[PDB]
Amino acid sequence: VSPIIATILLIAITVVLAATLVTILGGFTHGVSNTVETAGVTSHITSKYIFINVSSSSSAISASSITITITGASFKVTSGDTLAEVAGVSSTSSNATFTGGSDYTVPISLSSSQTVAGVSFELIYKGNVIYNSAA
Amino acid sequence: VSPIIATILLIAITVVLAATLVTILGGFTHGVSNTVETAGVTSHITSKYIFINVSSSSSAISASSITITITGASFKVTSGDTLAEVAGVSSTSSNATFTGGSDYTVPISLSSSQTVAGVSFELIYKGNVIYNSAA
Amino acid sequence: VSPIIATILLIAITVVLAATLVTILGGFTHGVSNTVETAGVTSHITSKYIFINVSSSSSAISASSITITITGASFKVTSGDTLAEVAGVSSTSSNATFTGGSDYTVPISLSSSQTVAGVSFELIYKGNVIYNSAA
Amino acid sequence: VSPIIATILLIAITVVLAATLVTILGGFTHGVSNTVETAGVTSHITSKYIFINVSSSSSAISASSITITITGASFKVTSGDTLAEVAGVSSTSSNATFTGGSDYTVPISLSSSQTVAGVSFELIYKGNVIYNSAA
Ligand SMILES: *[C@@H]1O[C@H](CO)[C@H](O)[C@H](O[C@@H]2O[C@H](CO)[C@@H](O[C@@H]3O[C@H](CS(=O)(=O)O)[C@H](O)[C@H](O[C@H]4O[C@H](CO[C@H]5O[C@H](CO)[C@@H](O)[C@H](O)[C@@H]5O)[C@@H](O)[C@H](O[C@H]5O[C@H](CO)[C@@H](O)[C@H](O)[C@@H]5O)[C@@H]4O)[C@H]3O[C@@H]3O[C@H]([C@H](O)CO)[C@H](O)[C@H](O)[C@H]3O)[C@H](O)[C@H]2O)[C@H]1O
Ligand SMILES: *[C@@H]1O[C@H](CO)[C@H](O)[C@H](O[C@@H]2O[C@H](CO)[C@@H](O[C@@H]3O[C@H](CS(=O)(=O)O)[C@H](O)[C@H](O[C@H]4O[C@H](CO[C@H]5O[C@H](CO)[C@@H](O)[C@H](O)[C@@H]5O)[C@@H](O)[C@H](O[C@H]5O[C@H](CO)[C@@H](O)[C@H](O)[C@@H]5O)[C@@H]4O)[C@H]3O[C@@H]3O[C@H]([C@H](O)CO)[C@H](O)[C@H](O)[C@H]3O)[C@H](O)[C@H]2O)[C@H]1O
Ligand SMILES: *[C@@H]1O[C@H](CO)[C@H](O)[C@H](O[C@@H]2O[C@H](CO)[C@@H](O[C@@H]3O[C@H](CS(=O)(=O)O)[C@H](O)[C@H](O[C@H]4O[C@H](CO[C@H]5O[C@H](CO)[C@@H](O)[C@H](O)[C@@H]5O)[C@@H](O)[C@H](O[C@H]5O[C@H](CO)[C@@H](O)[C@H](O)[C@@H]5O)[C@@H]4O)[C@H]3O[C@@H]3O[C@H]([C@H](O)CO)[C@H](O)[C@H](O)[C@H]3O)[C@H](O)[C@H]2O)[C@H]1O
Ligand SMILES: *[C@@H]1O[C@H](CO)[C@H](O)[C@H](O[C@@H]2O[C@H](CO)[C@@H](O[C@@H]3O[C@H](CS(=O)(=O)O)[C@H](O)[C@H](O[C@H]4O[C@H](CO[C@H]5O[C@H](CO)[C@@H](O)[C@H](O)[C@@H]5O)[C@@H](O)[C@H](O[C@H]5O[C@H](CO)[C@@H](O)[C@H](O)[C@@H]5O)[C@@H]4O)[C@H]3O[C@@H]3O[C@H]([C@H](O)CO)[C@H](O)[C@H](O)[C@H]3O)[C@H](O)[C@H]2O)[C@H]1O
């Protein structure tokens, strides 16, 4: 009798270990994707505007998917921080897509202590910095 | 009579062995998880401040989850040693999340014998070193 | 008596499981081989002929092992689709081996609607495309 | 009586099988180690001498741990075949360690039929070839 019953108990234990292992593996098999992007970007800064002109990019991406951050100044548009939003890009505009041939104008404001030589900005896509004016 | 009674005793013993084995296995089936993280980090050190600028990361993580340690100097903030805490990160601040585009300034103090060339620091997340200024 | 007999039955069952497992593994341990090839190839297309000139290759291979496919035109030789066959390569010919210094001429025919600008072709070896005129 | 006695016999058999298995495993769990080495080496050969100049190495190793073999010629030193030995390296010599900046001169002899164009040699460390003059 007993060697067969002991075998049935060990099969029952084996299934629970396998089910446990499957939940451990689930912590590895997610959140990996191709996030690399690369663009030819040029820029000019003034007391009122930042100009951004794109010459080429690795892929064509929406101007709403790009986040812009700034230091030494402030945006004149206050709703948020996507490139499409601060640049005033309408959905019909040519500049709705970030690719070679797209140009943007961002309006900015300086305090009494701030100066043009102190201003810099960065463009971020999928958590990677794709441009930095102070490089 | 006796061969059946001996069989009943062996079943009773078998259950206690199986119950014992289950408690042995419990020492293996815990504390395994995916703790790997990887970031593009750059840094500059001065007699008053450490600057830390992040360009990309493997995942988006809270600045309170990262621990910072220092040698050759001391922090001007004394409450603890999380990155959010020593850098003075408010909960509304852009720099509340550690990702590309996040920048931090940490204020520090040197003794009469300490010098800038002697200072170094490390960032630790889930018990792994993710950055070391002296690498 | 019975604990020994139960043990003999469990050995008999164990052998059949092991024999079963061996037949499962046989579905993995076949059909893996090094099929990569790479060649410097140049080509010119006309209303009557395709010219193919080889400058180098990763290995020396038989012209009968290479398959050619065409669109926008048709071959003047109708027996099949190996490179040796459609190019009229005799077994004594220098061009029997695909390597640097081997040249081939393939004769072709166009319909009333087909034109030279529409023609393209590919070379295939061991199920991989090694050249494509429209790349 | 008998089901308990049969159980005691099966425990005695189980221990001998486990002890047998332990001796099988001992044939796998030995003789695995990191034996890889890699060096920038340059060499020049003449009718009387081989010159060997080292520019870099993966690790710093003793010149007595390296074995040299030769064809088309013979060594003027006859005691053995370690690099330190045939090159006449004293224990105080700079060239006692194989690293960037170490240079060696090995004296050789040719027969009436042998010629400089026929000579070649190899350096061997832990059973791997680390340099071969005829590569
Ligand atoms: C992506 O693609 C899109 C689409 O192609 C854009 O090209 C985007 O780049 C943006 O382009 C816009 C348009 O040029 C830029 O916005 C302008 O900034 C200029 C200053 S500039 O020096 O001339 O170059 C102007 O301020 C312009 O606005 C005009 O409108 C102002 C407000 O007028 C509005 O309201 C009145 C009622 O009060 C209405 O009657 C009127 O119809 C209009 O709706 C005027 O004040 C302004 O006059 C003066 O402006 C400046 C001083 O600020 C001065 O320098 C000028 O010489 C001029 O004398 C001018 O007439 C801005 O355009 C937007 O206009 C809207 C308005 O709602 C109409 O849509 C807003 O009200 C803002 O005024 C402004 O956003 C933008 O900066 C670029 O990013 C590409 O990136
Ligand atoms: C993450 O994101 C967050 C949010 O964006 C941060 O950006 C963080 O980086 C931190 O930024 C802060 C803010 O800049 C840094 O803190 C400052 O260090 C500077 C020195 S610096 O050379 O100017 O760059 C200043 O010390 C600044 O403080 C100011 O406040 C001091 C104290 O004033 C306070 O108390 C008085 C009453 O005594 C109040 O009236 C006043 O309103 C204020 O509450 C001033 O002494 C100081 O003057 C002088 O300071 C230095 C000398 O130390 C000198 O170099 C300057 O030129 C100036 O003459 C200045 O006015 C610091 O900011 C914090 O201020 C708080 C205060 O409670 C207000 O919140 C503290 O009291 C500390 O003073 C200080 O923490 C910080 O180092 C960065 O980590 C990103 O990582
Ligand atoms: C790999 O290596 C091999 C070996 O080196 C090859 O080099 C291969 O490349 C191939 O080369 C051959 C040989 O050049 C190419 O085939 C020829 O195409 C030309 C046209 S071209 O403009 O001159 O360049 C010719 O058509 C040539 O054929 C000749 O033969 C024709 C038929 O004659 C045969 O039959 C008669 C009986 O009717 C016999 O008397 C005769 O001896 C022969 O057996 C002739 O019609 C032809 O005359 C005219 O041809 C063309 C018009 O089509 C015209 O442009 C010419 O100016 C000329 O006036 C010419 O005399 C082709 O060669 C092959 O010949 C065989 C024949 O059986 C002998 O072997 C076939 O009958 C075909 O005619 C033809 O396949 C080939 O295209 C290349 O792939 C390398 O890749
Ligand atoms: C690692 O690091 C070590 C330490 O730095 C070495 O540098 C090693 O490289 C070796 O260097 C040695 C030293 O240079 C090389 O050995 C020499 O080969 C030269 C030939 S060469 O063309 O000049 O370059 C010499 O043969 C030299 O020997 C001299 O000694 C000979 C023997 O003299 C000995 O015995 C007499 C008694 O008979 C004593 O009086 C004397 O003091 C000495 O002990 C001489 O014959 C020789 O004269 C002529 O030699 C050659 C012809 O063979 C000729 O070309 C010359 O122009 C010269 O006229 C010369 O004076 C070799 O050095 C070693 O000397 C020992 C001796 O015991 C002293 O230690 C041996 O007897 C051998 O003679 C010889 O091994 C070696 O080849 C390099 O590997 C780095 O790899």
Numbering used by the authors:
A (entry chain D), B (entry chain A), C (entry chain C), D (entry chain B): 12 to 146
Which statements did the authors publish about this structure?
Archaeal Type IV pilins and archaellins, which form the subunits of pili and archaella, respectively, are expressed as preproteins with a signal peptide. Through single particle cryo-electron microscopy (cryoEM) and helical reconstruction, we solved the structures of these filaments at 2.61 and 2.52 Å resolution for C. divulgatum and O. meridianum, respectively. Atomic model building, bioinformatics analysis, and motility experiments suggest that the C. divulgatum fibre is a nonrotary, likely adhesive T4P, whereas the O. meridianum filament is an archaellum.
The protein is 135 residues long and folds into an N-terminal α-helical tail, followed by a globular head. The FlaFind server, determined a class-III peptidase cleavage site between residues 11 and 12, indicating that the first 11 residues are proteolytically removed during the maturation of the protein, as is typical for Type-IV pilins The head domain is composed of six β-strands that fold into two β-sheets but unusually also contains three short α-helices (α2, α3, and α4). The densities for the two glycosylation sites were well resolved, allowing the assignment of six and five sugars for N64 and N106, respectively. In each of its three component helices, AapB adopts a unique conformation, distinguished by the angle between the head and the tail domain, as well as the structure of the hinge. In contrast to the twitching Aap of S. acidocladarius, the CdiP does not have the distinct three-conformer structure that has been proposed to aid the collapse of the Aap into the membrane during twitching motility, and indeed, we were unable to detect twitching motility in C. divulgatum. It follows that the long hinge may have evolved to provide the CdiP filament with particularly high degrees of flexibility, which may aid surface adhesion, cell–cell contacts, and biofilm formation. The cells mainly adhered to the surface of the substrate but did not display twitching motility.
